[PDB]
Design a protein that fits this description.
1 chains; dna binding protein/dna/rna; RNA-binding; CRISPR-Cas; 71 residues; elongated; Transposon
Length: 71
RNA sequence: CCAAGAAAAGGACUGGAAGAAAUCAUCCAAGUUGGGGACUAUUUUCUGCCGUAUAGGCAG
């Protein structure tokens, strides 16, 4: 992470959001426009799913209490 | 129905050798403790005979 435009961000977020200043510097450092056009898609895709676990993992903790009249 | 439930830290071991604390010295001067006073009371222990006897032994 780093501070940019007076907020908290990182490299993955600036490229997924299509932040032109970072893309212009990155192409200037030798990246082909076609390589960037593909990465913006794959990089974004990796942050679009699997945000909540499907099952409870067998080594996790579990504790139970009353809530709204039941456990 | 507890950041829930279960749990063997164990086995071994050489701190050693040697040494100089020393020399000197003025606590002094003065000083009012005093005045008054019940251990006996509702006590318990008297009266005699023998014996040279304030010795020693006895009845009531």
């Amino acid at each position: 992470s780093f501070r940019y435009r007076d907020d908290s961000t990182n490299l993955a977020l600036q490229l997924v959001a299509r932040s032109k200043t970072w893309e212009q510097a990155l192409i200037g450092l030798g990246l082909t426009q076609q390589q960037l056009d593909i990465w913006c898609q794959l990089l974004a895709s990796n942050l679009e799913n699997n945000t909540f676990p499907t099952v409870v993992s067998p080594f996790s903790k579990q504790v139970r209490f009353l809530y709204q009249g039941n456990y």
